[PDB]
Symmetry: D2
Amino acid sequence: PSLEDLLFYTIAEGQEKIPVHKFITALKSTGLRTSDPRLKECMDMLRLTLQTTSDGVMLDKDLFKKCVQSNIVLLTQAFRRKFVIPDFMSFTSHIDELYESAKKQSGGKVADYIPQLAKFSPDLWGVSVCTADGQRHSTGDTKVPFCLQSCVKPLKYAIAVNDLGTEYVHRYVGKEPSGLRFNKLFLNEDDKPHNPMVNAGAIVVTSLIKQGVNNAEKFDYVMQFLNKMAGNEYVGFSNATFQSERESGDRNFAIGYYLKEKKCFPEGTDMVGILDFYFQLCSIEVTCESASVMAATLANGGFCPITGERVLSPEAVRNTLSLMHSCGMYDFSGQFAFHVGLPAKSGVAGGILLVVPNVMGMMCWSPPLDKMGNSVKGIHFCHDLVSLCNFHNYDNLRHFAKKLDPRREG
Amino acid sequence: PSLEDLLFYTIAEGQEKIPVHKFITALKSTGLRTSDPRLKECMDMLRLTLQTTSDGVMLDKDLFKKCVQSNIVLLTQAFRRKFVIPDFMSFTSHIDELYESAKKQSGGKVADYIPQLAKFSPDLWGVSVCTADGQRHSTGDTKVPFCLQSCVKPLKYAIAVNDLGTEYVHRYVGKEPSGLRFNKLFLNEDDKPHNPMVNAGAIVVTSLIKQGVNNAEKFDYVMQFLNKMAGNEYVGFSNATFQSERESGDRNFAIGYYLKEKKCFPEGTDMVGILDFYFQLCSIEVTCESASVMAATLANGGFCPITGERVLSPEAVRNTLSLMHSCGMYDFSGQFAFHVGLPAKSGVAGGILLVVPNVMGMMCWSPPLDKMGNSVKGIHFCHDLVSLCNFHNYDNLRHFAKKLDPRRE
Amino acid sequence: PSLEDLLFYTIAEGQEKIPVHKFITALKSTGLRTSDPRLKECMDMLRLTLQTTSDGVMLDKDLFKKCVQSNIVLLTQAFRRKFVIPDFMSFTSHIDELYESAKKQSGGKVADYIPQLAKFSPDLWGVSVCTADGQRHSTGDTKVPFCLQSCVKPLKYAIAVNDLGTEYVHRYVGKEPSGLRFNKLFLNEDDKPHNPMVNAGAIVVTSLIKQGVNNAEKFDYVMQFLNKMAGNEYVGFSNATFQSERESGDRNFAIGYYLKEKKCFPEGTDMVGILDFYFQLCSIEVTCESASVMAATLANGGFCPITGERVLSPEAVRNTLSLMHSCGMYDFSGQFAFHVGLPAKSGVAGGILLVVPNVMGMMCWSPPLDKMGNSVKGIHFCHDLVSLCNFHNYDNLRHFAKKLDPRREG
Amino acid sequence: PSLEDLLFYTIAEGQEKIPVHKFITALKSTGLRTSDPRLKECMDMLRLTLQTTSDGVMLDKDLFKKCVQSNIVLLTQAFRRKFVIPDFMSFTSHIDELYESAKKQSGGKVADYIPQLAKFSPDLWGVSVCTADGQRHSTGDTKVPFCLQSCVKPLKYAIAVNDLGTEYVHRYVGKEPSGLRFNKLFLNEDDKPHNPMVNAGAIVVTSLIKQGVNNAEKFDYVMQFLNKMAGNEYVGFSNATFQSERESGDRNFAIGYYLKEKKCFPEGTDMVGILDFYFQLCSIEVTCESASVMAATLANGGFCPITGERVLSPEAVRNTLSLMHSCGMYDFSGQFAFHVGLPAKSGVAGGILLVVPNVMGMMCWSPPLDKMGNSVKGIHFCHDLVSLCNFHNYDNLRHFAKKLDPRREG
Ligand SMILES: O=C(Cc1ccccc1)Nc1ccc(OC2CCN(c3ccc(NC(=O)Cc4ccccc4)nn3)CC2)nn1
Ligand SMILES: O=C(Cc1ccccc1)Nc1ccc(OC2CCN(c3ccc(NC(=O)Cc4ccccc4)nn3)CC2)nn1
């Protein structure tokens, strides 16, 4: 027997030469992208076989074997429908309808409190999917960068817990929602911020990461970390957003000074610098595509699905998902957890980083916010998404009424 | 080919008659109990053959077909190791270790406010498991009756959502935790109680069930419902607990009048009557075994796992799970969601109704409570359980470090 | 010399027979009424000389002396302008302007939550004065009975402190305002109600009065007490108001059960019976005239000004004045204390029991209540009054700008 | 007749020359000090008579006329026992007893949060009286400087109202106590600090005074203002306290930024500069003697009692008294208003600026603070004072049980 030969016969279809475009089309049908880093040896070898000839361009079993040998494990599970979403082409047409249905919710106000969130057009709308297996799909404005803002809060929390542990991190930050009563209070009863997802909590978490080095290396290290989280897809920085966030962060300076007075920072913290680092971390830029890979890493137990690298420890991902569940959508967190039941995190730029554990990661983006700070189209999409699929954290995998389950084929 | 014959040969062992004590043993190893109602026809005929030919005791291949005939589907997935927990015998050895480690946590105080909770011994400790497929295991005092107390709140909420729908029910009760800053406040910003898991919310929920009949029919309507959730195992009533709760419920009488003044009940509500109904639902009794089937029904999308009956709509079960996750353990709820990450519900009798979605339901019971009202041993068990198995809501099924996965081989 | 004849010469005209109508008209100018209980022997004697032989309304120096003998001390300070308000006739003319200008504040809604207060016309508006010296003046509907409702709370608080002492009473009730929006929190940090002026505090206070006898004797004791406080003017009971307060007091029953569970009552308290006593105390009836004497006792250190009796201990009156200052006007207490600076207490029937310490007590009554529960006309009047006179608690008696001081002469 | 001649005979003692040492003793017994600025012409002339005529220290009627001529009015009310406290020598014996009674309360902790309050000895203890007529008495450490700290908050508020009016000032700051559940909150329901006596309210009030000039001119404008309140007695500045107060004020910097974000300052406010001004106003130094004249100015309707100057408008003084009544002693204000019933204001240095309206001003000073921030000895003295005299806001001036009234004779 031989696995490269088996794969060849199921794609060759009784024929005895496979055109290269027919293998690439079959490959995209799985949902993988030709630029998937795990396929680079096979793509490199197709580029090198495509130097021998403009004439022919077809692959027999040993030229097919010559190329796919290196990636045969990953290619066969794609072609034997063993990915988390077997009929991925069906699923993306459901993603497309959902996207078109939110695209009609043109309500909401674009954030204007700094001129950089204000440049953004209110009709921009993108959705990007990445599954725990690296199947990819985008629809809308998924390759235009925008700032993470508070979507960076779960990421730096994950980094902090990954490096220092749950017990150290939560000496300085709570792990509960504050209650739809104390959005205005900075501290709880043990004089810690309520959770890493609020501004007081995020600011303390920022003070914990890579202590003892300067802000340039702290920022470089986090940029490093989000690079592995996004499988090296687009991660950037908006100094324009950075400069406006700092000439307007009077609430954040208030929080910083309060926390300094309540001794909420580690010993030896230069608070005003932490606020500068914090403003930098919220001006980091992503696209829907690159952010959905960050989301997919959290959906995949800490392994980036398009590279296979272990990026976060399982304790760090669990905590971050646990706190995205309950504190992730500002004053909407309770309603979102009840009706949508997915770990999610909103930001004022209009992104909603969304995680379906064991299935997929996503980044929705539309700048118009609702009265609570969450993207109107984004919020609409997540209700529709869970209304269509048994993706709700407490849906049942066996008895789920008339909803659809993309993890299965029949 | 044929399914009874294959199953025969995989148990027949190359040999050509199967002793029934060996068939009964292979069966119990899967985790089913021979008294599973889904198995009653196969058991009834095994008893009839042990009568019709009392000479002999062994089963040839066509007498085997005569017995496993109508339950062959369930028997095959039991014997082909296809239940949610394939190696049930190993897993119960883990449950036993977990129980013995929680059994040495002797802290906590038994509830004193009525002499019925105080007469319970502090050495009582039991955990009962029931899977989404009906595999059962017990350890400790799992056949001792006790009242559900607030463990009844997620059930009556589920009954309410099942009968009237999410939107109607939550016209009268919120869907969030209050914030552990407001056990003291009864109402949220829209003058509804914060959620069904606090006393004020349960009292409003109690007022929604079976409107228009008297308390005797409402109670029996709830009783029919809880019988079905537990596959007809023990569901009872303590009038002793009921009478003491009503002569000491000055706080719930306080809540009732407040809700009446703030107009939180549906029109035409007899507030004091609802309060009497509420004290009754909190005096309903279960054992660990019978309640664990109720928990397993919630883990099973609303189908009772030992009968196959649809008891609750999936909307009802999902809502109830979401609110047990966040509001189920009084002031320990946030910590419980973070560290244990399981839908659970505490009661003052010392029970913790616990649900691992898609796997199993459980009921742990130990009367000594901690400072927050949660059973000391029960809480210790739930931390151990999640530290051992990847059952945490946001554990990963593919990458889970040093944890054990009982769903895997 | 002689004090009765000196008095005679001061009314005597330079002439030396005084007509009896001239003495009585000169008497009323003082602000005293001929039916003042301290004047009864002098009136009894005028009733008897007015028998003599009806010829000549005149009193010679020996017949005048025969009548004014027994009350000569009180009559001499009345006629030698030694009362707290010397020119009382001028002062009532300002009361009349203040009354007529408030009479045009037609805003507000009559309480209708029971049909007995809803029965009252918004037409009704009365003001009654009684000074620390027994000078009386009314304007408007001052002889119509209405219920005290929460205006009774300072009075039963005074009775409690008079009988048991400050220390015992305040084991069960706080002595501060709650903070203006804690009206439905029932207890403070020490699990006592915030003060006697809120429903929870009043309910605890009711449980403290005359412990150990039944509600009929408890009520008879408070009624006798309010009789001595009003110099035996009208005090009654509206059973109509009583039954509607009790078949509608769901908030008061909620409060009672809450207090029972938190063990806020003295040992051996029958909770639902106390609530019945409390509903009775709020159904006690007064008129403006009768109630202004009760207020005047409070302005007078606990001595009723029209009888001379010690009715309340000074400790009881001081505390009651202290808490009417801060807690007397519901959510208006802070604004009322700041701008008006007088101890006052409102009730839902439209009353405002008002005390000017060392000067006079008042009862304003107009049923239409404002958005906060206080009588519109009454509130308008209390501002005008303090805007006209240096009666504000922190006005200065020596340097007081544009304001008038009715205690001075020229 | 003639007023200089009358006064001579009541002192002339039956003789026809008054020894000057005897006139000075008769004067001091009234409670005036010979250096009273209102007495300067009489003292300058006695000193000059003591130079021109060494030949016998005796004063006849024509030379006694020569000295008391210019200050004749004030001298007569001093000697004809018309000052607010006629038997001033008796009363000071009561102040001394009260002082020695609190001197035995050696509990409490001296504030150490900056090294300047930490070096004050714990049994420094002084009380200084100044009446509405300028009668003075001190006992203990009454001439040692200390900073006002929050004792400056009522003075700046009075200056703000004096210059800008009630309506303007209270556009930016409330006028009620917060409630012993909102001591931690910075803002009320209308996004203003609760009252001028808490730090957020003091900080906004500081931002209102003398807008448009720099901090040097602002500072001199307030000092010049506090100089008149103290009859030009010692008002100074501790730069040491100022430098340590600005390097420890992260809580007030927290307050500043929060108020900036919630826009609680006038337009064009330099917040960080206002904070510097705020740190200066609390480092202003006084003694018990000089501060008690400031208190006496508020007790005297805005006139400094030892000079005759109008320093504050009556509206300014009334408001400031109303808000020290209810908001002046941190979390102790309600208990203090209830039991002591006097306008007072506490500071972390151990001062309590105390005002008995229409009678006298006081400053008590003892550095050891109790749990709530109030000077242990100061608070004990203030209870003692009101248990001894009927100065309580709602004591009665006519019926006051066994208490003493220093306004009366015997
Ligand atoms: O341990 C605790 C808390 C706690 C909770 C539970 C048990 C015990 C202890 N520390 C703690 C936390 C937060 C906090 O607050 C600070 C101060 C400023 N800051 C404001 C400041 C004004 C406001 N103002 C309003 O809410 C106005 C308003 C009031 C009422 C109705 C409507 C509006 N909000 N936040 C936010 C930070 N202080 N201390
Ligand atoms: O010693 C304490 C606490 C304490 C002490 C020391 C240190 C920390 C704590 N006592 C105490 C007193 C009263 C009290 O409350 C009771 C029960 C419910 N009860 C409601 C219930 C809901 C409402 N409604 C709302 O809150 C809605 C709302 C919420 C927010 C903003 C706007 C509206 N009102 N009253 C009336 C009375 N609990 N505990």
